[PDB]
Amino acid sequence: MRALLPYLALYKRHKWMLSLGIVLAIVTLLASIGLLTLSGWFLSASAVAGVAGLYSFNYMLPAAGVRGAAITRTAGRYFERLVSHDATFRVLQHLRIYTFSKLLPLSPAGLARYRQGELLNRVVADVDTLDHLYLRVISPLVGAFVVIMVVTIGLSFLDFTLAFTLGGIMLLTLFLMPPLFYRAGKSTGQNLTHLRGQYRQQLTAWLQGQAELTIFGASDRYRTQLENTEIQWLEAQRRQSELTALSQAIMLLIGALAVILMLWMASGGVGGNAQPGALIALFVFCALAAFEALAPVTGAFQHLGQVIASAVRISDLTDQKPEVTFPDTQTRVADRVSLTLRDVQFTYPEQSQQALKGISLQVNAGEHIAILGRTGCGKSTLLQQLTRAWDPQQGEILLNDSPIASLNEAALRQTISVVPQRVHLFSATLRDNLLLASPGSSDEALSEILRRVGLEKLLEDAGLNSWLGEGGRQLSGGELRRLAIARALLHDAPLVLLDQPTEGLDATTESQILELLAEMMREKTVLMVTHRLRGLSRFQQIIVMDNGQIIEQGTHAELLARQGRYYQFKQG
Amino acid sequence: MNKSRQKELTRWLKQQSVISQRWLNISRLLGFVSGILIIAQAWFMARILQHMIMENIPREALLLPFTLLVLTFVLRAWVVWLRERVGYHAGQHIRFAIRRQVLDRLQQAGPAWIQGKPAGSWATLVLEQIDDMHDYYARYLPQMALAVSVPLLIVVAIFPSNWAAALILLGTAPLIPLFMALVGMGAADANRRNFLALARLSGHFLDRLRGMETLRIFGRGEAEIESIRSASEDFRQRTMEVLRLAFLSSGILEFFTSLSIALVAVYFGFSYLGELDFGHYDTGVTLAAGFLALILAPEFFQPLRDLGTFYHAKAQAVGAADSLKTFMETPLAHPQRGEAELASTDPVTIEAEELFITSPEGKTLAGPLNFTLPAGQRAVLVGRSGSGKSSLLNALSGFLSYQGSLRINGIELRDLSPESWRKHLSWVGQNPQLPAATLRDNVLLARPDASEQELQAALDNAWVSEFLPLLPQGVDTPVGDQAARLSVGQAQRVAVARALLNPCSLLLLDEPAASLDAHSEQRVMEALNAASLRQTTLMVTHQLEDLADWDVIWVMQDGRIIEQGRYAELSVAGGPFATLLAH
Numbered sequence A: 001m002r003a004l005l006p007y008l009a010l011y012k013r014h015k016w017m018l019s020l021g022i023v024l025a026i027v028t029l030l031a032s033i034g035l036l037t038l039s040g041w042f043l044s045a046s047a048v049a050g051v052a053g054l055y056s057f058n059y060m061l062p063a064a065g066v067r068g069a070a071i072t073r074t075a076g077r078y079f080e081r082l083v084s085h086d087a088t089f090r091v092l093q094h095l096r097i098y099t100f101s102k103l104l105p106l107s108p109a110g111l112a113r114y115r116q117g118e119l120l121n122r123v124v125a126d127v128d129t130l131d132h133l134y135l136r137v138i139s140p141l142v143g144a145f146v147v148i149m150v151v152t153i154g155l156s157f158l159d160f161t162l163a164f165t166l167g168g169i170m171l172l173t174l175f176l177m178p179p180l181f182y183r184a185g186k187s188t189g190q191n192l193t194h195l196r197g198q199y200r201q202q203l204t205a206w207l208q209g210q211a212e213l214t215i216f217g218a219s220d221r222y223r224t225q226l227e228n229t230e231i232q233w234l235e236a237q238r239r240q241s242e243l244t245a246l247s248q249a250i251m252l253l254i255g256a257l258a259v260i261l262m263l264w265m266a267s268g269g270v271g272g273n274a275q276p277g278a279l280i281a282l283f284v285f286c287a288l289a290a291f292e293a294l295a296p297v298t299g300a301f302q303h304l305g306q307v308i309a310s311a312v313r314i315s316d317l318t319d320q321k322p323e324v325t326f327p328d329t330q331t332r333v334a335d336r337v338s339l340t341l342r343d344v345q346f347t348y349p350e351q352s353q354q355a356l357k358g359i360s361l362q363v364n365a366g367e368h369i370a371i372l373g374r375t376g377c378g379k380s381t382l383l384q385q386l387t388r389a390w391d392p393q394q395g396e397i398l399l400n401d402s403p404i405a406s407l408n409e410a411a412l413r414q415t416i417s418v419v420p421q422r423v424h425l426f427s428a429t430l431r432d433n434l435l436l437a438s439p440g441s442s443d444e445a446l447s448e449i450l451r452r453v454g455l456e457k458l459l460e461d462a463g464l465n466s467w468l469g470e471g472g473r474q475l476s477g478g479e480l481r482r483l484a485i486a487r488a489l490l491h492d493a494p495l496v497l498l499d500q501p502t503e504g505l506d507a508t509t510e511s512q513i514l515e516l517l518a519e520m521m522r523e524k525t526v527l528m529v530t531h532r533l534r535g536l537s538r539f540q541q542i543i544v545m546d547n548g549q550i551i552e553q554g555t556h557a558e559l560l561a562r563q564g565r566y567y568q569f570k571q572g
Numbered sequence B: 001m002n003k004s005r006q007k008e009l010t011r012w013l014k015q016q017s018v019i020s021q022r023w024l025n026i027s028r029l030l031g032f033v034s035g036i037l038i039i040a041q042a043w044f045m046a047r048i049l050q051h052m053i054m055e056n057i058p059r060e061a062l063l064l065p066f067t068l069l070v071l072t073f074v075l076r077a078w079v080v081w082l083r084e085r086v087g088y089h090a091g092q093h094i095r096f097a098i099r100r101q102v103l104d105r106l107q108q109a110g111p112a113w114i115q116g117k118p119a120g121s122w123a124t125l126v127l128e129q130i131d132d133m134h135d136y137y138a139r140y141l142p143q144m145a146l147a148v149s150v151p152l153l154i155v156v157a158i159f160p161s162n163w164a165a166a167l168i169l170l171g172t173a174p175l176i177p178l179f180m181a182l183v184g185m186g187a188a189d190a191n192r193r194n195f196l197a198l199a200r201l202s203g204h205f206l207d208r209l210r211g212m213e214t215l216r217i218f219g220r221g222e223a224e225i226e227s228i229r230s231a232s233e234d235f236r237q238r239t240m241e242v243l244r245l246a247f248l249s250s251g252i253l254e255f256f257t258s259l260s261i262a263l264v265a266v267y268f269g270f271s272y273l274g275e276l277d278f279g280h281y282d283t284g285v286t287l288a289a290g291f292l293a294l295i296l297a298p299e300f301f302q303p304l305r306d307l308g309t310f311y312h313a314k315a316q317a318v319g320a321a322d323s324l325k326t327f328m329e330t331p332l333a334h335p336q337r338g339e340a341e342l343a344s345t346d347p348v349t350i351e352a353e354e355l356f357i358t359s360p361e362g363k364t365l366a367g368p369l370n371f372t373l374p375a376g377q378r379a380v381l382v383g384r385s386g387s388g389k390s391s392l393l394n395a396l397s398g399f400l401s402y403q404g405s406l407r408i409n410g411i412e413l414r415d416l417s418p419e420s421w422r423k424h425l426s427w428v429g430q431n432p433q434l435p436a437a438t439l440r441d442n443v444l445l446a447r448p449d450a451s452e453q454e455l456q457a458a459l460d461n462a463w464v465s466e467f468l469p470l471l472p473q474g475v476d477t478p479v480g481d482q483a484a485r486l487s488v489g490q491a492q493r494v495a496v497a498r499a500l501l502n503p504c505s506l507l508l509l510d511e512p513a514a515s516l517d518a519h520s521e522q523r524v525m526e527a528l529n530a531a532s533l534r535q536t537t538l539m540v541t542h543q544l545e546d547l548a549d550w551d552v553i554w555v556m557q558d559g560r561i562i563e564q565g566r567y568a569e570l571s572v573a574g575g576p577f578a579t580l581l582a583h
């Protein structure tokens, strides 16, 4: 239960509304017990008085109490729910946005530790599970504790033995039964949290892989795995249902015992008189009514094992410290960028071999560099070091003769343009897929950059307003390839990193793109990763990598004459 | 909102409950037994209370009524325990069967139709919206009989005692259902927009999570927090709108419940004193009559307050059914599931006659296609990017709908059984994905019981075994989310190992050697060239100089095949291929 402390500390926000809901929950209960307690005594007092005692009996005041308690019961409960549910879902809104804000700082390596469908389960489903903590643990428990004391103290004036017999049963139930239901349901609650997030991960993975699973006949055996998780999840759901049913049955028997004891015990005497008379109905109808205050009490702790399990999931995600940290100092973005690497080494998390081993290159401002190498030789790992995806181990990287780790994050993103090897098409509109880079661009600039990159057919019909991605239109592989080039051309950064930008493009389209890049990327430092040794004459320097090292480095003409690894790439 | 649509969703919801019809009737019977036992309990307390208070009977003389009162209490706790478990069991059987229907259709839908929603919105549809139907089946359906029979049985027990008390309860009931229907007319639409905002918030989150790398590249952290804040704020406001309707209806029904309890208490209290004389059968109003009506007054409205509470569970299921019913209605790739199948495992022949390939939204992807690929022959698709080359391969996989003719061995593709057709299919796709946990589980996707010799042959041919020593666990190394453990060219060769592991009647290759350098493209193409000769093959590629032995070359432009023939004829004859080859 120590994991709920950070989330009970969100009561400080909206503390006036959350404490107002507690007060109105107490007042609602007091009026609810009083309505049935006054009617039980009023009927018995009136019956005993009879016609003869009409003038001696003050019947107007009880008639006002039952009327007054009727509105207070219905008005209090309505308003208690309004204020408590309003504040609760404002707390859950802030908790959700706060939990989402932790993801991008963890993006390259921290997010790889989790599955994407489980991360989705935490931010939407596990945050929503914590509504139990703000709606139905604090208000029911302190509402029932105050009402029991008010009932016990109030009845103590009439008789001490009867008050503590009813009060003792209620107080013993309040302090002994909910902890019993917490232990009986915490293991189920942990499974219930685990199995819902495992089902959502398996379902999203199963859905996002249906192109491959269907063709290779693995959909059924991956649906069987998913359908087995639902069997376990439904079994845990049924286990919690039996606990609720047992809780309700037991609450009916404890309340029965209080009524039975009050009937038997108060009959002998109430306050020392042989014939209590109407005071018997006072205690019997108090026991019959006061046990409505303990109804939500047992379920407050029974569902806490699932709330604690969820709160651990959110806390784990928000307690992650990002591996890469940026200075808060404000820096000016330079118009010319020349980067320097001296013996850069990098090892991936949970790995033994180095992806980069002593990479060293000096790229002057305005130079265009082509990087060549085998598959899996660290070409993409190099371009991601330059983006501060990871901090290098036993190396140093400098931009304009200043360390790359000393740049403000806003300045680092304004000085580097990247075309990733895998292009993500977001599920927004076409305009928003291009407003990632240069948010202030107009539709005239967005439309023109699409014409240059060859995506003019994408401007037809809805055009910029057309919805792209999931729930909309997929672009082809080439159209995605050209959409990423359009993004990087809009960013307009001094340093441009291109990871195989002309990939999956036909010969004519590639020529048009390479012609466009050559024009737009003038007086820009460009590191272009290619698997195609075409138009390498233009590049002022060619880098050939192998197993995370720069094997040979020189101009296109020099690399052919010496007939190194590059020459074999060209012809062979 | 439309009431006609809502009336159609309630019919669909009510049909799913037939499987649990026995359990729903048992809870109706058990809920009536609870009404009987609460009348008996109120009668025993009133008889005991009347004897002690008015006749001063010692508690020892009253032992049979205590014995029966305790017995009634024990029986009532047993029925409540039974009824909760019966109702839950009915609800999850219906939920399990509804989710099976949804997942059954998602299998037949394929990747093209799964594209219709963000993957996070599919999860809301399957998890949140099917699970929120429970209280409709478990609670609301049994309650309709209990909302009529239980209050009626309460009243019948009070006419023989006091006819004025039974009219106070019946005088307040008729406004209960009118106010129930008045508050809840907009509850089904408020729930529909609540699930709409939850699916939008869930689909938006998983989309930005999968593109978190592109967001970090461009520094969209502040912008994406606001986009979540907007989607989260909308969901919070739709949730509130659902809740204030359930609080208002609950409060209004509590007002009448409390008004009647006060009215019964005041009527009997004044009747005992003699303030008013009506309401009794020429006999003094006994104290047992007052206690019986007082205990049973809250229980007269319980079945009616529960019906109002479960009327909003019904509205929650109707708003949850709106999105499910739409999915279960939209036609799939082919209107009728094919039953025909082809027996021979020999390479198939493909014929297309005025073939049109369209999206799920009806937009044509490839124009009139007329070609023929004889059995065992291999064809090459080349052309400009965005000319619909990949759409033809997706239509051959059975993923897209087509309007013309597309015959496999003379049998229309839509008439083929999709599961049996896919056993004669193998392909490497554009930007391939690795769904299995490890590298070995991915290569063995086609059949996980392959021999170690067959597995090693695929890894050797696909040039995968060269980077195996780099991986820590070797072939058992997990690949991670979207194969994050592998480089792009390494995941490309793992997808080539899938295609080359089982024999097939037709092999499709979208971009088999993508993201491979000059040398590794040669070794991978050595395996794919030999594999393309073993059966009918349709490869899409941008490489042109490398291919000269392929039987026929198809060039598309704007979704239409415009040249056919071998490399020798097309290279020197001009046209678009020579222009394509010129660069």
Ligand SMILES: Nc1ncnc2c1ncn2[C@@H]1O[C@H](COP(=O)(O)OP(=O)(O)OP(=O)(O)O)[C@@H](O)[C@H]1O
Binding pocket: A348, A349, A351, A355, A373, A374, A375, A376, A377, A378, A379, A380, A381, A382, A421, B470, B484, B485, B486, B487, B488, B489, B490, B515
């Ligand atoms: N997340 C990761 N964890 C561990 N190792 C990784 C990870 N991503 C890549 N690697 C490994 O790092 C090495 C270099 O990977 P990198 O992505 O830099 O290759 P690359 O040269 O870009 O390849 P390609 O040309 O195929 O795109 C390979 O052994 C690769 O499998």
Ligand SMILES: [Mg+2]
Binding pocket: A379, A380, A381, A421, A499, B487, B488, B489
């Ligand atoms: Mg790479």
